[PDB]
Amino acid sequence: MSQVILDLQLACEDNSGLPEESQFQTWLNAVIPQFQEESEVTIRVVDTAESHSLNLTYRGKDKPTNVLSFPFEVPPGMEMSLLGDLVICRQVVEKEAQEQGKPLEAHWAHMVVHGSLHLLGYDHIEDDEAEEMEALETEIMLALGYEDPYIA
Ligand code: NI
């Protein structure tokens, strides 16, 4: 099997100019299935304020970020398909894509791809650990038809 049930939550004042739910679905299929097959993730797009708040109260960082990853812990001895949530700030994503001169769409995809990896247990604090994650990101991204966000 291969199935990623997506719960897309648009929680911005506007909600216009965001990726189509099918796009998120597409990006999600290129990252998760190959690790869980049967799974489901929630992804809510928010505004700087909420992001700022979530980031400060859960990561202890006074500022908004592009992607907050909240991986679901599975209680010892339990079958669970729920992977966690991705909180993506549209303001940050749009600003970054502009500063890095990347296609807004390609950056969004990167956000859910990177985020999804964090949901699956990947991290990038340790050089070796990061090397493995970026390798995967690059791979997934090329397979989606976007340029490799790395190699700069
Ligand atoms: Ni990260």
UniProtKB/Swiss-Prot annotation:
This entry's Gene Ontology molecular function terms read:
metalloendopeptidase activity; nickel cation binding; RNA endonuclease activity, producing 3'-phosphomonoesters; zinc ion binding
Q: Which Pfam families match?
A: YbeY
Keywords attached to this Swiss-Prot or TrEMBL record, sorted alphabetically, are:
Cytoplasm, Endonuclease, Hydrolase, Metal-binding, Nuclease, Ribosome biogenesis, rRNA processing, Zinc
The enzyme's E.C. designation: 3.1.-.-
Q: Which GO terms describe its biological process?
A: maturation of SSU-rRNA; response to heat; ribosomal small subunit biogenesis; ribosome biogenesis; rRNA processing; transcription antitermination; translation
What does the UniProt record report as the effect of altering H114A in this chain?
Loss of activity
- Quote the disruption phenotype from the UniProt entry: Mutants show defects in 16S rRNA maturation, ribosome activity, translational fidelity, and ribosome assembly. They have severe growth defect at high temperatures, essentially no thermotolerance at lethal temperatures. They also show a decrease in polysomes and a large increase in both free 50S and free 30S ribosomal subunits relative to 70S ribosomes.
According to its UniProt record, which cofactors does this protein need? Zn(2+)
Q: Under what name is this protein listed?
A: Endoribonuclease YbeY
What triggers its expression? By heat shock.
GO cellular component assignments: cytoplasm
- Per UniProt, Zn(2+) binds at H114, H118, H124
- The answer to whether the entry has keyword Nucleotidyltransferase is no
Which SUPFAM superfamilies does the record match to this protein? Metalloproteases ('zincins'), catalytic domain
Q: What is the scientific name of the source organism? A: Escherichia coli (strain K12)
Q: How is the cofactor bound?
A: Binds 1 zinc ion.
Q: How is its activity regulated?
A: Inhibited by EDTA.
Q: What InterPro entries does this protein map onto?
A: MetalPrtase_cat_dom_sf_prd (IPR023091), YbeY (IPR002036), YbeY_CS (IPR020549)
Summary of the function given for this chain in its UniProt record = Single strand-specific metallo-endoribonuclease involved in late-stage 70S ribosome quality control and in maturation of the 3' terminus of the 16S rRNA. Acts together with the RNase R to eliminate defective 70S ribosomes, but not properly matured 70S ribosomes or individual subunits, by a process mediated specifically by the 30S ribosomal subunit. Involved in the processing of 16S, 23S and 5S rRNAs, with a particularly strong effect on maturation at both the 5'- and 3'-ends of 16S rRNA as well as maturation of the 5'-end of 23S and 5S rRNAs.
Compartments annotated for it: namely:
Cytoplasm
Which protein family is named in the record? Answer: Belongs to the endoribonuclease YbeY family.
Record-linked PANTHER family = ENDORIBONUCLEASE YBEY, CHLOROPLASTIC
Its primary localisation, in coarse terms, equals cytoplasm
